[PDB]
Design a protein around this nucleic acid. Structure first.
Lengths: 404, 252
RNA sequence: UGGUGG
DNA sequence: ACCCACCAAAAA
C-alpha cells in the first residue's frame, strides 16, 4: 500500500469527481497537476459538478492556508464481491475487485473494475460479433451476486450466451460463485424469520414476508391486490444479499469505531491492560465482555466495541495482549468518518488511515472464520466452510485499490 | 435558546406528520362538511377522509395502489373497492376508465403543501442528540418510535454505540457550495421540488449557528442510514456537496 | 406506479 | 422467481 499526503488525497478526490475514478493513483494526480490552475472552469464538464466544486474550493482554501471541513471520499470497488472473495478465500475473485493487487505485464498495480474484466473475458471467448453491451453484463453480474437468476437469463437468454456467462464466472471467481450457488439451497421452508449475530453483537432478524394476492372486481373488471404478509417459502433468494450486506454494515460500524475513537477510553484500556487502572467493576459488563470475546475466538474479528465492557474484573477473561495489539493497529490520531454503506468520507489528512483500516478489516474477514460463523446460524446447525486460499489474508493487508 | 430552538424544530416536525396533517385539511379545515356528506352516501367517516387524503397525495393512482393504503379498514379487499366506486360516483373524485386511474378533485391548499414540503421529514438536531440506551427513541427529544427502520423492531442488541458515535459528529453547511447549486446547478444537470424549500429549511436550521447533528438509524441488517431529506450526506449529489464537518482542520 | 442513493 | 432504504406524485 503506497501512502499519500493530505493535499494529494484532495487531488485524487477532485480527479475522482471529474471523474477519472477508474484511473490509477498516480495518473489521477498527474491529471490534477495538469489542470490545477484551471479547475474552476472544469466544473461545468465534471461528472459531479457540485462535489467537484466543493473539493476544488477546498483545494483553494488549503493553498491559502485556510482550515477546511470538506471530507474526501474513498469508495469500495464492488464491496459485495470483495466480501464474498474474503469470506471464501477466493484469490481469483479478489483480483477482480482490488482485494489483492493485480499487475499487468508491465507490472504496475492496476485499479481493477471487476465488471469490465468479466465483460472483456466474455467478449474474448464469445467472439466474432458478440451481441452484448458492457452494461447489460454489469447488471447481470451484480444482480447475480445478490442472488438473481431471472436477470442474467434476461440479458443472456437461456442458451449458449448464458452458458458462457456462468462459465466465465466460475473460472474468474470459483469459490465466490460456488458460495452464491450454495446460499440459494439454504432456505428453510418452515422458517418465518432468520436470525444471526454479528461478531460485534448486532442481531440480524429477517422476517419472511410473502405476497398475499386478494383479487377484486371494480366495474365487473378484475384487479389484483398484493400485500406483503408474513409467511414461508420453499426456496429463498435473499440470504446472499442480506448476509453480505450485514457484513459491510459491520465493516462500517467497526471502521467508524477504530477511526472515530475516544482518546480517553483508549488510554484507560491501555492502563487496564497493563494493570495500572484504579479498580472499577460492574457486574453488568461481564455478560457482554464474555459474549464479544467469544466471537473473537470463533471468528477472528475482535471488535473495538469490546472497550465498552472491559473493567478491572472483566479484563481477566480476555487476552490483554490481543487488546493492546488492536489499539496499536488503530490510527494515532482519531478522525470522523461519514459512510454510505461502502463509500467513506474523511478529512484528507487522514486518507492514509482510512485505507489502512479498511484493508485490516477485509484482511480480518479473509483470515478468519466469519462465513462459517454466520452460515451456521442461518441454516440451524454447525457447518464449516474452508478457505480456498488460507493465505489470501496476508496479501489483503497490503492491497492497493480496495478503496479508490 | 438552542435547546428551545431544537424543541421548536421538533414542534414543527411533530405537527406536520404527512397523513395526520392532511386529514386536518379534510376535517377541521374544509368548507365542505365531509362528515355529513359521508353519512349521506353511506361511507364510513374515517375511511372517506383517508381516501380523500390519499387522493391529495397520489393525485393519480391505479386501483391496486389505492386499496393498499386503505386495506386496513375492511374485512375484505372487495369491500374497499366498492366503497371507492360509491365515492367516485358521488364526485368525491373521478375515475377515468380510459387510463384506469383515479384523478384527484379536492386537493390541499398551496400554503399547507409548502409546510408539508418543509417539515414533514426529519431535520437535523441543533443540539447534541439524546444518547440512545434502548432500541426506542432515535435521538430527538419527542419521538420514541422503534429505532430500526420499517417494521423490524427487536429489543436485542443492535449496536447503539455506532448510532451514538455517528450522531455526535457535528456538521455544518458550506454556503458557498449551497449557493452554487441554486444559482448554477440547473444548467449543469425531483431537483426543483427539493431546492424550492431546501434553502429556507437550511436557513431556519442554522438560525442559532451553522452547526448541527444528523441522526442515524439501522435497518434490520445493520446498514446505517442518516435520517433526513433536505440535509443529508447520503442521498443526492446536490445534497452531499453542501455538507462538511463543523470541526474544520488545517490540512497542511 | 415511477425516481433517489447503495 | 433481485437486496435494502427512501422519495415522488397528474392536465380541458
Amino acid at each position: 500500500m503506497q501512502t499519500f499526503t493530505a493535499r494529494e488525497y484532495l487531488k485524487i478526490d477532485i480527479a475522482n469527481n471529474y471523474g477519472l475514478d477508474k484511473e490509477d493513483w498516480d495518473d489521477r494526480i498527474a491529471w490534477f497537476d495538469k489542470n490545477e490552475n484551471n479547475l474552476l472552469n472544469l466544473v461545468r464538464e465534471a461528472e459531479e459538478p457540485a462535489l467537484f466544486y466543493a473539493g476544488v474550493k477546498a483545494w483553494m482554501d488549503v493553498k491559502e492556508g485556510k482550515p477546511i471541513g470538506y471530507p474526501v471520499a474513498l469508495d469500495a470497488t464492488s464491496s459485495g464481491l470483495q466480501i464474498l472473495a474474503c469470506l471464501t478465500g477466493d484469490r481469483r475473485a479478489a483480483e477482480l475487485c482490488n482485494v489483492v493487487n493485480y499487475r499487468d505485464e508491465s507490472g504496475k498495480v492496476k485499479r481493477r473494475d471487476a465488471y469490465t474484466v468479466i465483460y472483456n473475458k466474455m467478449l474474448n471467448t464469445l467472439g466474432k460479433g458478440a451481441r452484448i453491451k458492457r452494461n447489460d453484463c454489469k447488471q447481470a453480474i451484480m444482480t447475480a451476486l445478490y442472488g438473481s437468476e431471472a436477470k442474467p437469463k434476461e440479458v443472456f437468454g437461456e442458451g449458449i450466451m448464458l452458458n458462457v456467462f456462468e462459465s466465465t464466472m466460475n473460472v474468474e471467481a470459483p469459490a465466490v460463485w460456488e458460495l452464491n450457488k450454495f446460499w440459494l439451497q439454504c432456505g428453510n421452508p418452515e422458517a418465518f424469520v432468520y436470525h444471526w449475530v454479528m461478531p460485534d453483537g448486532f442481531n440480524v432478524y429477517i422476517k419472511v414476508m410473502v405476497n398475499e394476492v386478494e383479487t377484486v372486481h371494480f366495474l365487473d373488471k378484475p384487479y389484483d391486490c398484493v400485500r406483503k404478509v408474513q409467511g414461508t417459502e420453499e426456496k429463498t433468494r435473499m440470504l446472499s444479499a442480506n448476509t453480505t450486506h450485514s457484513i459491510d454494515g459491520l465493516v462500517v460500524r467497526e471502521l467508524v469505531r477504530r477511526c472515530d475513537y475516544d482518546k480517553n477510553q483508549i488510554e484507560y484500556i491501555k492502563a487496564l491492560c497493563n494493570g495500572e487502572a484504579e479498580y472499577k467493576a460492574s457486574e453488568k459488563n461481564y455478560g457482554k465482555a464474555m459474549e464479544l470475546w467469544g466471537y473473537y475466538e470463533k471468528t477472528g474479528f475482535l471488535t473495538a466495541r469490546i472497550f465498552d465492557y472491559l473493567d478491572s474484573e472483566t479484563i481477566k477473561l480476555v487476552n490483554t495482549q490481543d487488546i493492546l495489539d488492536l489499539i496499536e493497529s488503530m490510527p494515532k490520531k482519531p478522525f470522523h468518518v461519514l459512510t454510505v454503506h461502502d463509500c467513506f468520507r474523511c478529512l484528507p489528512n487522514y486518507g492514509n488511515d482510512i485505507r489502512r483500516q479498511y484493508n485490516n478489516l477485509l484482511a480480518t474477514i479473509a483470515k478468519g472464520d466469519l462465513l462459517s460463523f454466520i452460515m451456521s446460524q442461518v441454516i440451524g446447525q454447525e457447518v464449516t466452510i474452508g478457505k480456498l486460499d488460507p493465505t489470501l489474508w496476508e496479501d489483503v493487508l497490503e492491497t492497493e485499490y480496495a478503496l479508490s | 435558546s438552542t435547546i428551545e430552538h431544537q424543541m421548536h424544530l421538533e414542534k414543527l416536525y411533530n405537527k406536520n406528520q404527512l397523513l395526520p396533517r392532511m386529514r386536518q385539511e379534510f376535517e377541521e379545515n374544509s368548507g365542505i362538511d365531509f362528515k355529513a356528506f359521508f353519512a349521506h352516501i353511506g361511507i364510513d367517516y374515517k375511511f372517506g377522509i383517508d381516501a380523500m387524503v390519499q387522493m391529495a397525495l397520489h393525485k393519480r393512482a391505479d386501483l391496486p395502489t389505492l386499496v393498499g393504503t386503505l386495506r386496513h379498514h375492511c374485512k375484505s379487499a372487495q369491500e374497499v373497492a366498492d366503497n371507492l366506486f360509491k365515492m367516485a360516483s358521488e364526485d368525491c373524485f373521478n375515475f377515468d376508465p380510459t387510463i384506469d386511474k383515479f384523478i384527484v378533485i379536492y386537493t390541499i391548499s398551496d400554503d399547507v403543501q409548502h409546510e408539508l414540503d418543509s417539515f414533514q421529514y426529519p431535520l437535523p438536531m441543533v443540539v447534541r442528540p439524546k444518547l440512545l440506551t434502548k432500541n426506542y427513541g432515535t435521538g430527538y427529544f419527542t419521538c420514541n418510535k422503534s429505532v430500526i427502520l420499517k417494521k423490524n423492531h427487536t429489543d436485542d442488541d443492535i449496536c447503539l454505540d455506532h448510532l451514538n458515535r455517528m450522531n455526535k459528529i457535528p456538521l455544518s453547511i458550506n454556503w458557498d457550495v449551497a449557493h452554487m447549486v441554486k444559482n448554477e446547478w440547473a444548467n449543469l444537470d425531483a431537483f426543483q421540488k427539493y431546492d424550492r424549500t431546501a434553502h429556507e429549511v437550511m436557513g431556519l436550521l442554522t438560525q442559532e449557528g451553522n452547526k448541527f447533528y444528523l441522526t442515524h438509524r439501522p435497518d434490520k441488517r445493520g446498514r446505517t442510514y442518516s435520517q433526513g431529506y433536505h440535509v443529508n450526506y447520503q442521498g443526492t449529489s446536490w445534497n452531499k456537496a453542501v455538507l462538511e464537518f463543523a470541526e474544520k482542520e488545517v490540512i497542511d
